[PDB]
Amino acid sequence: SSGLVPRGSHMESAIGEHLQCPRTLTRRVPDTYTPPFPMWVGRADDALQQVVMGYLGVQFRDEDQRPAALQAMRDIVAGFDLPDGPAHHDLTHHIDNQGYENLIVVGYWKDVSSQHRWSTSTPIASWWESEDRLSDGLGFFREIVAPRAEQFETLYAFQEDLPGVGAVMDGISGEINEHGYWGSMRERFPISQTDWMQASGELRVIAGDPAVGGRVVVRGHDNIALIRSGQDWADAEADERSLYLDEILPTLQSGMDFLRDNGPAVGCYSNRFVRNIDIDGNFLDLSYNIGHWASLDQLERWSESHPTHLRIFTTFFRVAAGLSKLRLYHEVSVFDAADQLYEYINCHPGTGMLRDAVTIAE
Amino acid sequence: MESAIGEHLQCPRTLTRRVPDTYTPPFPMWVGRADDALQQVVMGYLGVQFRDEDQRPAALQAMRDIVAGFDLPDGPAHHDLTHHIDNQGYENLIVVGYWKDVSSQHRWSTSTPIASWWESEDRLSDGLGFFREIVAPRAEQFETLYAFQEDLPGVGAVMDGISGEINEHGYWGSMRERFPISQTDWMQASGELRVIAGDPAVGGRVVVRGHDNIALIRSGQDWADAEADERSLYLDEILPTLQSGMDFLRDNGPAVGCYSNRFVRNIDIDGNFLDLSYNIGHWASLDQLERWSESHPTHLRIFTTFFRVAAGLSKLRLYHEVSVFDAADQLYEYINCHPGTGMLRDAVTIAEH
Ligand code: HEM
Ligand code: HEM
């Protein structure tokens, strides 16, 4: 039956038991398929219906704005302690291709109604709506997206202390079957059992004007995809730190720069390559991509063809056997139009979903 | 757009593709077409092996003898000739013949001039190694892919013509989808590659039986029409990456599920080289071949190098054919070959399975 070390059809599935159904869209590997290295996925029971991933940002241009920016980031984080705040968060920094610095606090909620109560609560809404946000001279944004349980997948190359959305799930799976081949990401989405997750519609400005600053609201469209793909080398030994910093990162950086600067050509609305920071703005040894894509298909096409991702993909297969403390993972999600809110205050026109959004009158 | 799967071979699907029906490939490719008359083909690879330079005249005469046999009634519809030196330093002349049906190849093999030659005691006293690796995929059990639309080599030479631009290519997993049987069947491998007569370690006559869904790839390169600048791109940029991958599979086959990897150059009847080459690769399963092509750094380096230089290409002809077979539709026979030859290397003895 099932051995000590299960293989093929005896291995666990990425798809939670309560979300399984007979596949009308079938897998691309035979029943005997057994991956060459272990990967695990986040588990949650049926109580997790729909999560919220809220990326809350503070943007600035000049050195003399850094104190005000850090103060604002700290105020956002303080707001997380209030009732209905997110169950997990982390803080990051990056400089965008227009030279603006961006601090982003990402929060994860286990329930949509909870996030909505938090956002509407007086302390939070008064801060977000305040005229102070305009007089601050800083840019702010909220890119808040809510995939149902069937609409996201996770993959971790480790088992303990899961970052991102894994932190708000119940626990970790055993070693899963649906990984190690192109097309496996799609297969890991429970909705993939029956649905092609095809994009339709257009990113559209529904309030304000990206070109002139002030307050701007962009509506998403069906099956925009969001990838968070991360690297953590903080506790690794010197040799694994070198593997990452010297052998992986320069190529990863090249690929991230490519998506950042060639987005419209490949279907990437926004690409950010961010470094974790502490509450004081100082760098930590963790990083990740935050990538918003016009479709899951376009993300698939890029990942399986661009030389940068192919090189690092192949490095991982090589070092997989010996990996001890270097931590790599991703989470990918798709969303209905109604389950996405992209709001900007005094951000430059290239920020996030402002860049490719169809203006209020085309 | 046109489908890789012939109209008569399209059926109600129980297994789906990995892309939606709206997928559009980023560059054109074409496939071989044949109607319902082509039911099952035979690919017969007939080899002559030798170690020492003084055996070359006898080896070449043997090759000419085999080719003359191809001219008899029920001989193959198409053939080509190749040379390579294997990782044991032996030279190998291989004549591949393609037949459009199983019965004709059987009539041919059992016909007195052919059977008498293969069964002769002379084969044991020639000092040469001889082999026959003969496999017969049904129409639903092979796929082709050509980056050109004329004079198809290999199995394409025995099909009826060429398609228009096809939908099912340009993403990993597209090869599987070009097999008509993928509409309903995983082409899962089962069974063992097994010695059923003789002992590879001892020589003489050895017979190996295949297993269900062994896969065979012939992936080819033809630069015979290239002018100087394009020859440089192929020989100086592409070929070193191809060479690296071929060396890898030749020398690390068990690790990735490749039973046999040959990288061969076409020759004319005199044994002189032509500017065409191909891989002949036998694999333990179609999915092991898929894993190598899509995740091994060797093929990925070939892939990326190709796209880096592609804008300077025009006359270079690249193609492949891949087949899977039932156990019964494979025959691997060796006479006085070294123990690493073809299916002899990895085949297990009767008591080892
Ligand atoms: C340290 C950096 C990275 C490494 C070493 C790496 C490596 C890999 C590996 C080994 C896989 C296959 C996982 C499995 O199924 O077992 C994979 C999948 C994937 N990666 Fe990355 N990756 C990195 C960063 C990224 C980034 C920043 C992106 C953003 C576009 C990306 C996009 C993808 C996608 C879309 C897949 C799924 C492919 C599929 O299953 O169809 N990766 N990556
Ligand atoms: C210079 C020689 C080669 C070049 C430039 C090259 C390039 C490529 C390209 C561009 C593709 C994707 C084709 C498409 O779908 O449009 C491909 C697919 C493939 N190649 Fe190669 N290749 C070469 C040699 C080989 C060889 C010798 C092998 C033998 C194992 C091989 C095995 C494969 C396989 C199995 C696929 C199918 C992948 C799939 O669709 O799942 N290739 N190759």
Coordinates of C-alpha atoms in Angstrom, one line a residue, chain A:
Chain A
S1 CA 0.0 0.0 0.0
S2 CA 1.5 3.2 1.3
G3 CA 5.2 2.8 2.2
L4 CA 7.4 4.5 4.9
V5 CA 8.4 7.1 2.2
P6 CA 5.2 7.5 0.1
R7 CA 5.7 7.9 -3.7
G8 CA 3.5 8.4 -6.8
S9 CA -0.3 8.4 -6.1
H10 CA 0.4 7.6 -2.4
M11 CA 1.8 11.0 -1.7
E12 CA -0.2 13.9 -0.2
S13 CA -1.9 16.4 -2.5
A14 CA -1.3 20.1 -2.5
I15 CA -5.1 20.5 -2.6
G16 CA -6.8 20.4 0.9
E17 CA -9.2 17.4 1.3
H18 CA -12.3 19.6 1.6
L19 CA -11.5 21.3 -1.8
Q20 CA -10.8 18.2 -3.8
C21 CA -13.2 17.1 -6.6
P22 CA -12.9 14.9 -9.7
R23 CA -10.7 16.8 -12.2
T24 CA -12.3 17.9 -15.5
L25 CA -9.0 19.6 -16.3
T26 CA -6.5 16.8 -15.8
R27 CA -2.8 16.8 -14.7
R28 CA 0.2 16.5 -17.0
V29 CA 2.1 13.8 -15.2
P30 CA 1.3 10.0 -14.9
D31 CA 0.1 8.4 -11.6
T32 CA 3.6 7.2 -10.7
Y33 CA 5.1 10.7 -10.8
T34 CA 7.4 11.3 -7.8
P35 CA 9.3 14.6 -7.4
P36 CA 13.1 14.5 -6.9
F37 CA 13.1 16.9 -3.9
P38 CA 10.6 17.7 -1.2
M39 CA 8.2 20.6 -1.1
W40 CA 5.4 21.3 1.3
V41 CA 2.3 23.5 1.2
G42 CA 0.2 25.4 3.8
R43 CA -2.9 23.6 5.1
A44 CA -6.1 25.0 6.3
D45 CA -9.5 23.4 7.0
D46 CA -12.9 24.7 5.6
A47 CA -12.9 27.5 8.2
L48 CA -10.5 29.4 5.9
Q49 CA -12.9 30.5 3.2
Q50 CA -11.2 33.6 1.8
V51 CA -8.1 35.4 3.0
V52 CA -7.1 39.0 2.6
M53 CA -3.6 40.1 1.6
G54 CA -3.2 43.8 2.2
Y55 CA -0.1 45.6 1.0
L56 CA 0.0 49.0 2.6
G57 CA 2.7 51.3 1.3
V58 CA 4.4 54.6 2.0
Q59 CA 6.4 56.2 -0.8
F60 CA 9.0 59.0 -0.8
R61 CA 11.5 60.6 -3.1
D62 CA 14.0 62.5 -0.9
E63 CA 16.3 61.7 2.0
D64 CA 14.7 64.5 4.1
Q65 CA 11.4 62.6 3.9
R66 CA 12.7 59.4 5.5
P67 CA 11.9 60.3 9.1
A68 CA 8.2 61.2 8.1
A69 CA 8.0 58.0 6.0
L70 CA 9.3 55.7 8.9
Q71 CA 6.8 57.5 11.3
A72 CA 4.0 56.7 8.9
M73 CA 5.1 53.0 8.5
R74 CA 5.2 52.8 12.3
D75 CA 1.7 54.3 12.5
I76 CA 0.4 51.7 10.0
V77 CA 1.9 48.9 12.1
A78 CA 0.5 50.3 15.3
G79 CA -3.0 50.1 13.6
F80 CA -2.5 46.4 13.3
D81 CA -2.7 45.9 17.0
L82 CA -6.3 47.1 17.0
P83 CA -9.3 44.7 17.0
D84 CA -9.7 42.9 13.6
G85 CA -6.1 43.7 12.7
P86 CA -4.2 41.2 10.5
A87 CA -3.0 37.9 12.1
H88 CA 0.5 38.3 10.5
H89 CA 2.5 41.1 8.9
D90 CA 6.0 41.9 7.6
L91 CA 7.8 45.1 6.5
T92 CA 9.9 45.7 3.4
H93 CA 11.7 48.4 1.5
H94 CA 12.6 48.9 -2.2
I95 CA 13.6 51.7 -4.6
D96 CA 11.5 51.7 -7.8
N97 CA 12.6 52.5 -11.3
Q98 CA 11.7 56.1 -10.9
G99 CA 14.1 56.3 -7.9
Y100 CA 11.3 56.6 -5.2
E101 CA 11.7 54.7 -2.0
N102 CA 8.7 52.5 -1.0
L103 CA 8.1 51.0 2.5
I104 CA 5.4 48.3 2.3
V105 CA 3.7 46.7 5.3
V106 CA 1.9 43.5 4.2
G107 CA -0.9 42.2 6.4
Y108 CA -2.7 38.9 6.2
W109 CA -6.2 38.3 7.4
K110 CA -7.9 34.9 7.8
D111 CA -11.3 36.4 7.0
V112 CA -12.7 39.0 4.7
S113 CA -15.3 40.5 7.0
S114 CA -12.6 41.0 9.7
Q115 CA -10.4 43.0 7.3
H116 CA -13.5 45.1 6.3
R117 CA -14.4 45.8 10.0
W118 CA -10.7 46.8 10.6
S119 CA -10.7 49.1 7.5
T120 CA -14.0 50.8 8.5
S121 CA -13.1 51.1 12.2
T122 CA -12.7 54.8 13.3
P123 CA -8.9 54.7 14.2
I124 CA -8.1 53.2 10.8
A125 CA -10.5 54.9 8.5
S126 CA -9.8 58.3 10.0
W127 CA -6.1 57.9 9.4
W128 CA -6.6 56.7 5.7
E129 CA -9.2 59.4 4.9
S130 CA -7.4 62.2 6.8
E131 CA -6.2 65.5 5.1
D132 CA -3.0 64.8 6.9
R133 CA -2.2 62.2 4.2
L134 CA -2.2 65.0 1.6
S135 CA -0.2 67.5 3.7
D136 CA 2.4 64.8 4.7
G137 CA 4.1 65.1 1.2
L138 CA 4.4 61.3 1.2
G139 CA 2.7 58.8 -1.2
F140 CA 0.5 56.1 0.3
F141 CA -1.2 53.1 -1.2
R142 CA -3.4 50.1 -0.3
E143 CA -3.4 47.2 -2.7
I144 CA -5.8 44.8 -0.9
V145 CA -6.8 41.5 -2.6
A146 CA -8.9 38.6 -1.3
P147 CA -8.6 35.2 -2.9
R148 CA -10.9 32.4 -1.9
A149 CA -9.3 29.2 -0.6
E150 CA -9.7 27.6 -4.1
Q151 CA -7.9 30.7 -5.6
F152 CA -4.4 30.5 -4.2
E153 CA -1.5 28.0 -3.8
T154 CA 1.6 28.0 -1.7
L155 CA 4.9 26.1 -2.0
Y156 CA 7.6 25.9 0.7
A157 CA 11.1 24.3 0.5
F158 CA 11.0 24.0 4.3
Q159 CA 8.5 23.1 7.0
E160 CA 8.9 25.5 10.0
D161 CA 7.9 29.1 10.6
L162 CA 6.0 29.8 7.4
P163 CA 6.2 33.4 6.0
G164 CA 3.5 35.2 4.1
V165 CA 0.0 33.7 3.9
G166 CA 1.4 30.4 5.3
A167 CA 1.6 32.2 8.6
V168 CA -2.2 32.5 8.9
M169 CA -3.0 28.9 7.7
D170 CA -3.5 26.0 10.2
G171 CA -0.2 24.2 9.5
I172 CA 2.0 22.4 6.9
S173 CA 1.2 19.5 4.7
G174 CA 3.3 16.4 4.2
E175 CA 5.5 16.2 1.1
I176 CA 3.3 16.9 -1.9
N177 CA 3.1 15.4 -5.3
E178 CA 2.1 18.3 -7.6
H179 CA 5.4 20.1 -7.9
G180 CA 8.7 19.9 -9.8
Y181 CA 7.4 20.5 -13.4
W182 CA 6.1 23.4 -15.4
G183 CA 2.3 23.4 -15.0
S184 CA 2.5 22.3 -11.4
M185 CA 1.8 25.8 -10.0
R186 CA -1.6 25.8 -11.9
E187 CA -2.4 22.3 -10.7
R188 CA -1.9 23.4 -7.1
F189 CA -4.8 25.9 -7.3
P190 CA -7.8 24.0 -6.2
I191 CA -10.0 25.9 -8.7
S192 CA -7.7 24.4 -11.4
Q193 CA -9.5 21.1 -11.1
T194 CA -12.4 22.6 -13.1
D195 CA -11.6 26.1 -14.2
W196 CA -9.0 27.7 -16.6
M197 CA -8.7 30.9 -14.5
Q198 CA -8.7 32.9 -17.7
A199 CA -8.3 36.7 -17.4
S200 CA -11.1 38.9 -18.7
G201 CA -11.7 42.7 -18.4
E202 CA -9.4 45.5 -17.9
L203 CA -7.6 47.4 -15.1
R204 CA -9.8 50.6 -14.9
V205 CA -9.5 53.9 -13.0
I206 CA -12.8 54.4 -11.1
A207 CA -11.9 57.6 -9.1
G208 CA -9.4 60.4 -9.7
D209 CA -6.5 60.5 -12.2
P210 CA -3.2 58.7 -12.1
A211 CA -1.5 61.5 -13.9
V212 CA -2.0 64.3 -11.3
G213 CA -1.5 62.7 -7.9
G214 CA -4.2 63.1 -5.2
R215 CA -6.5 60.1 -4.5
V216 CA -6.8 57.5 -7.2
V217 CA -8.8 54.2 -7.1
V218 CA -8.2 51.4 -9.7
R219 CA -10.6 48.4 -10.1
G220 CA -8.9 45.1 -10.9
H221 CA -10.3 42.5 -13.3
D222 CA -11.1 38.8 -13.2
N223 CA -8.0 36.6 -12.7
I224 CA -5.3 39.0 -12.2
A225 CA -2.5 36.9 -10.6
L226 CA -0.3 37.9 -7.8
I227 CA 3.0 36.2 -7.0
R228 CA 5.0 36.6 -3.8
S229 CA 8.2 34.5 -4.2
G230 CA 10.7 34.8 -1.3
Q231 CA 14.3 34.2 -0.1
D232 CA 15.5 34.0 3.5
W233 CA 19.2 33.5 4.2
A234 CA 19.3 35.1 7.7
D235 CA 20.2 32.0 9.7
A236 CA 22.1 30.1 6.9
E237 CA 25.8 29.0 7.2
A238 CA 28.4 31.0 5.3
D239 CA 28.4 28.6 2.3
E240 CA 24.7 28.8 1.8
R241 CA 24.7 32.5 2.2
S242 CA 27.3 32.6 -0.7
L243 CA 25.2 30.3 -2.8
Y244 CA 22.3 32.8 -2.5
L245 CA 24.2 36.1 -2.6
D246 CA 26.8 35.2 -5.2
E247 CA 25.2 32.4 -7.3
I248 CA 21.5 33.1 -7.2
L249 CA 20.9 36.8 -6.5
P250 CA 22.8 38.4 -9.4
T251 CA 20.7 36.4 -11.9
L252 CA 17.5 36.9 -9.8
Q253 CA 18.2 40.6 -9.7
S254 CA 18.6 40.7 -13.5
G255 CA 15.2 38.9 -13.9
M256 CA 13.4 41.3 -11.5
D257 CA 14.9 44.3 -13.2
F258 CA 13.7 42.9 -16.5
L259 CA 10.1 42.5 -15.3
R260 CA 10.2 45.9 -13.6
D261 CA 11.3 47.7 -16.8
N262 CA 9.6 45.5 -19.5
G263 CA 6.2 44.9 -17.8
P264 CA 3.7 45.8 -20.5
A265 CA 5.5 43.6 -23.1
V266 CA 5.2 40.4 -20.9
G267 CA 1.9 41.2 -19.1
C268 CA 3.4 42.2 -15.7
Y269 CA 1.4 45.2 -14.3
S270 CA 3.8 45.8 -11.4
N271 CA 7.0 44.1 -10.3
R272 CA 8.6 44.8 -7.0
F273 CA 11.8 43.2 -5.6
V274 CA 11.8 44.1 -1.9
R275 CA 14.1 43.5 1.1
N276 CA 12.7 42.9 4.6
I277 CA 13.3 45.6 7.2
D278 CA 12.7 45.9 10.9
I279 CA 10.5 48.6 12.5
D280 CA 13.4 51.0 12.4
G281 CA 14.0 50.6 8.6
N282 CA 17.2 48.6 8.9
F283 CA 17.6 45.6 6.4
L284 CA 17.1 42.0 7.4
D285 CA 18.4 39.0 5.4
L286 CA 15.0 38.2 3.7
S287 CA 13.6 39.4 0.4
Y288 CA 10.8 38.7 -2.0
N289 CA 9.2 39.6 -5.3
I290 CA 5.7 41.1 -5.3
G291 CA 4.4 40.6 -8.9
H292 CA 1.0 41.6 -10.3
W293 CA 0.2 39.9 -13.7
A294 CA -2.5 40.5 -16.3
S295 CA -3.0 36.7 -16.3
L296 CA -1.7 33.5 -14.7
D297 CA -0.9 32.4 -18.2
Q298 CA 1.5 35.3 -18.8
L299 CA 3.3 34.5 -15.5
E300 CA 3.6 30.9 -16.6
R301 CA 5.0 31.8 -20.0
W302 CA 7.7 34.1 -18.5
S303 CA 8.8 31.7 -15.8
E304 CA 9.3 28.8 -18.2
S305 CA 11.2 30.8 -20.9
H306 CA 13.2 33.7 -19.5
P307 CA 16.9 32.8 -19.1
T308 CA 17.1 34.4 -15.7
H309 CA 14.3 32.3 -14.1
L310 CA 15.5 29.2 -16.0
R311 CA 19.0 29.6 -14.6
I312 CA 17.9 29.9 -11.0
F313 CA 15.3 27.1 -11.4
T314 CA 18.1 24.9 -12.5
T315 CA 20.5 26.0 -9.6
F316 CA 17.7 25.0 -7.2
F317 CA 17.4 21.4 -8.7
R318 CA 21.2 21.1 -8.3
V319 CA 21.5 22.2 -4.6
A320 CA 18.1 20.8 -3.5
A321 CA 19.7 17.6 -2.1
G322 CA 22.2 19.5 0.2
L323 CA 20.1 22.5 1.2
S324 CA 20.0 23.0 5.0
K325 CA 19.0 26.5 6.1
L326 CA 18.4 28.6 2.9
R327 CA 14.7 29.1 2.8
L328 CA 12.8 29.6 -0.5
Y329 CA 9.0 29.6 -1.1
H330 CA 6.2 31.2 -3.0
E331 CA 2.5 32.0 -2.8
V332 CA 0.5 32.7 -6.0
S333 CA -3.2 33.9 -6.1
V334 CA -5.9 34.9 -8.5
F335 CA -9.0 37.0 -7.7
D336 CA -12.4 38.1 -9.0
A337 CA -12.7 41.7 -10.0
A338 CA -14.8 42.5 -6.9
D339 CA -12.1 41.0 -4.6
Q340 CA -9.4 43.6 -5.4
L341 CA -9.0 47.2 -4.3
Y342 CA -6.0 49.4 -5.4
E343 CA -6.0 52.8 -3.8
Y344 CA -3.3 55.5 -4.2
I345 CA -2.6 58.9 -2.5
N346 CA 0.0 61.2 -4.0
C347 CA 1.9 58.4 -5.7
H348 CA 3.9 58.9 -8.9
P349 CA 2.0 57.6 -12.0
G350 CA 4.2 54.5 -12.4
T351 CA 3.3 53.2 -8.9
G352 CA 1.7 49.7 -8.8
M353 CA -1.5 49.4 -10.7
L354 CA -1.5 53.1 -11.7
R355 CA 0.9 52.5 -14.6
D356 CA -1.3 50.3 -16.8
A357 CA -4.8 51.3 -15.6
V358 CA -7.2 52.5 -18.3
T359 CA -8.1 56.1 -17.5
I360 CA -11.5 57.1 -16.3
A361 CA -12.6 57.9 -19.9
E362 CA -10.2 55.5 -21.8

